[PDB]
C-alpha cells in the first residue's frame, strides 16, 4: 500500500471502472498514448478483466464497430484523442458501440467539449474528468507528460517565450492533479535560487489549486492540509546530474542503454529483454543499493543448489524447485545487467570515479581543502580509453567546483581537449542559472556537515535535495530562500504528513534514492519527488545543448 502506483490505481478503479461497472456485463476500453502509459504503469493489463474490461484498443487506430458492447473511453483532453472519439459518434454519425463512457485524465476545454456535446449523442451516457495527469514511475516518484518542457523552459529568448508559458501552465495544472490524487492541498513554497522559474511556477500552482477544490466534486479536501509542496529549479544542483553515480539504478540507466526501463539481452539465444519495474520486487530491493553491496546480498550462490544433493523431504525439494525455477530465472537477469555494468566499471568507470568524487566534493579522498583542483582533473585525459561524454562531464564538475571560471581558460579546454563540436554542452549551462563565465555568483549555498560514514569512499557525494528534504522535515529552512457530542470540525483522514518535491528540468536517479532513503530513515512523512522527466547524464547534455537553437 501507499506505493504511488497503488494510490493511482485505487483512484482509477473507483473513479472510472467502478463508476460505469455493471456486474453482469463487460465492455470495451479505449486508450490514447498517455492513458496507455498510465495504465501500464500501475497494473498488469490482465487485472482489467476483474474490472469489467474484456478488450482494450488504441483509440487512434481505426476500429471495427461493435454495436452490442458499451465503450469506455479513458483518454486525455487532447484534440487528437477527442477527434478519434468524434470519429466514433460524431462524423458520419455512424455509432460504433452501444454506448460511450468518457473519462478525461484532466479538465476538458470548452473548445473540445463543445465539439463533443454538439455531436451528437445520445449514446454518451457519461463524460467525467478524474484528474490524473502524471505517471507513477515508482512507488514514490512521479513524472508528468509535458513534451519538450526542458527546452522551452530554458530557451534563450526568441519567439519561444509564448510556448514557454504554455509549458509552465501545463506543468502547473499537471502538478495539481498529483496533489488531488494524494488528496493533499499543500502549501506552495518555491526557491529563490537560479533564475526565478520556480517562483513563477509556484504562483501558477498556488493559484491553480485555489481554483481547484473550489470546484472539486469529490468533496474530500478543502483548504490547505498538513503537507508542503516545494518547487525548485534545476540550477540548484548541477553536480548530481553529472556524477557517475554508483548505486545500481542510477549507474545502469547511465552506463547501459536502458531506454524505456527495458534492458535488452543477451543473454542468451535469442536475445530477449527485461523490464525494471516494481512488479519485479527483486530489482526493488537492489535498485538503491551500492554496486558492491548489491553483489554481496543475492549473488553467489545459495549453491550447490541449497542443500542438494536420505530424503524425508524429497518430494518437498522436488516441488520447491519447480516454483524456484523463476526465482533463479529472475536473479539471473538482475545479474547479467549487473555484469554489463561491472565491466564498464572495471574497464575505466572505476578510475573515472576516483577523480570525480574528489572534485565534486573538492575535498574528498581525505584530501581536505585540496587547493589546485585542475591537478585533480588531469588524470581523466590520458585514461582515454574514454568518451567525449565522460570528458565534458569531468570538466563540468571542475567548473562547478570553482564556480564561475575565466573566459580564456575555458576556451583552451574546448580546444586542446578536443570537444570541438558538442561544445555547447558546457556553454548552455548558464541558461539554467549556473555560472559559466562570470566568476563567483551566489558564492554557493550551505549544506549539512557529516559526512559521518561513507563506505567505498567514492559515493561520498549527497544530492542537495536530501539536505533540503530534511531541512523541511526538521523545519529548519531559510524563509528568505524558501518563500511562500455536537461540535462540527471538518474530518478527517487519511493521507497525513507528505513532502511533495518537484524539480524543474528533470530529476536524477540518484536524487530518487533521496526520496526513499529519507522517507525510509523517517516514517512520520513520505517524501515524493517528481518532474517532467528522469535524467541521464548523456540525455541531459544533449538537451542542455540545442537550447541556443530554435527548433528546427
Amino acid at each position: 500500500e501507499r506505493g504511488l502506483k497503488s494510490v493511482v490505481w485505487r483512484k482509477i478503479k473507483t473513479a472510472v471502472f467502478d463508476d460505469c461497472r455493471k456486474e453482469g456485463e463487460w465492455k470495451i476500453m479505449l486508450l490514447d498514448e498517455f492513458t496507455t502509459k498510465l495504465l501500464s504503469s500501475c497494473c498488469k493489463m490482465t487485472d482489467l478483466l476483474e474490472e469489467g474490461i474484456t478488450v482494450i484498443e488504441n483509440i487512434y487506430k481505426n476500429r471495427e464497430p461493435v454495436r452490442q458492447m458499451k465503450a469506455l473511453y479513458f483518454i486525455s483532453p487532447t484534440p487528437k484523442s477527442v477527434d478519434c472519439f468524434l470519429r466514433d459518434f460524431g462524423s458520419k454519425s455512424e455509432k460504433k458501440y452501444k454506448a460511450a463512457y468518457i473519462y478525461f485524465t484532466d479538465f476538458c476545454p470548452d473548445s473540445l467539449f463543445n465539439k463533443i456535446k454538439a455531436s451528437c449523442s445520445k449514446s454518451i451516457r457519461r463524460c467525467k474528468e478524474i484528474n490524473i495527469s502524471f505517471i507513477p514511475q515508482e512507488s514514490q516518484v512521479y513524472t508528468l507528460d509535458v513534451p519538450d518542457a526542458f527546452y522551452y523552459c530554458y530557451s534563450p529568448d526568441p519567439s519561444n517565450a509564448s510556448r514557454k508559458e504554455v509549458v509552465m501552465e501545463a506543468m502547473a495544472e499537471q502538478i495539481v492533479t498529483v496533489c488531488a490524487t494524494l488528496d493533499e492541498n499543500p502549501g506552495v513554497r518555491y526557491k529563490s535560487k537560479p533564475l526565478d522559474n520556480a517562483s513563477k511556477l509556484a504562483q501558477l500552482v498556488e493559484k491553480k489549486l485555489e481554483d481547484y477544490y473550489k470546484i472539486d466534486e469529490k468533496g474530500l479536501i478543502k483548504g490547505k492540509t498538513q503537507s508542503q509542496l516545494l518547487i525548485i529549479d534545476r540550477g540548484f544542483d548541477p553536480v548530481s546530474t553529472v556524477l557517475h553515480e554508483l548505486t545500481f539504478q542510477a549507474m545502469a540507466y547511465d552506463l547501459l542503454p536502458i531506454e524505456n526501463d527495458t534492458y535488452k539481452y543477451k543473454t542468451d539465444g535469442k536475445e530477449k529483454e527485461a523490464v525494471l519495474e516494481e512488479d519485479d520486487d527483486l530489482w526493488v530491493r537492489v535498485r538503491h543499493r551500492h554496486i558492491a553491496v548489491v553483489l554481496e546480498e543475492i549473488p553467489k550462490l545459495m549453491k550447490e543448489i541449497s542443500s542438494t544433493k536420505s530424503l524425508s523431504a524429497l518430494t518437498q525439494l522436488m516441488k520447491k524447485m519447480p516454483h524456484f525455477r523463476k526465482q533463479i530465472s529472475k536473479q539471473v537477469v538482475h545479474l547479467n545487467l549487473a555484469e554489463d555494468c561491472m565491466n564498464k566499471f572495471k574497464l575505466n568507470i572505476e578510475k573515472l570515479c576516483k577523480t570525480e568524487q574528489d572534485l565534486a566534493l573538492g575535498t574528498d579522498a581525505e584530501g581536505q581543502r585540496v587547493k589546485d583542483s585542475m591537478l585533480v582533473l588531469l588524470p581523466v585525459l590520458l585514461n582515454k580509453n574514454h568518451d567525449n561524454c565522460d570528458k565534458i562531464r569531468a570538466v563540468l564538475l571542475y567548473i562547478f567546483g570553482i564556480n564561475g571560471t575565466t573566459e580564456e581558460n575555458l576556451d583552451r579546454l574546448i580546444h586542446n581537449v578536443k570537444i570541438e563540436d558538442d561544445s555547447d554542452m558546457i556553454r548552455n549551462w548558464s541558461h539554467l542559472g549556473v555560472p559559466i563565465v562570470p566568476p563567483s555568483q551566489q558564492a554557493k549555498p550551505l549544506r549539512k556537515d557529516r559526512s559521518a560514514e561513507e563506505t567505498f569512499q567514492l559515493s561520498r557525494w549527497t544530492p542537495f535535495i536530501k539536505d533540503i528534504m530534511e531541512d523541511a522535515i526538521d523545519n529548519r529552512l531559510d524563509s528568505k530562500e524558501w518563500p511562500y457530542r455536537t461540535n462540527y470540525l471538518e474530518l478527517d483522514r487519511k493521507n497525513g504528513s507528505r513532502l511533495i518535491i518537484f524539480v524543474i528540468g528533470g530529476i536524477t536517479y540518484s536524487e530518487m534514492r533521496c526520496a526513499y532513503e529519507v522517507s525510509q530513515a523517517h516514517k512520520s512523512c513520505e517524501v515524493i519527488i517528481g518532474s517532467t522527466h528522469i535524467l541521464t547524464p548523456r540525455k541531459l547534455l544533449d538537451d542542455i545543448k540545442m537550447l541556443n537553437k530554435s527548433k528546427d
Binding site: 467539449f113 463524460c127 474528468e129
Partner: peptide, 9 residues
C-alpha cells in the same frame, strides 16, 4: 467541473 455528464444534456 469534475462531472460533465449533466452538462451534455
Amino acid at each position: 467541473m469534475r462531472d460533465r455528464t449533466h452538462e451534455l444534456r
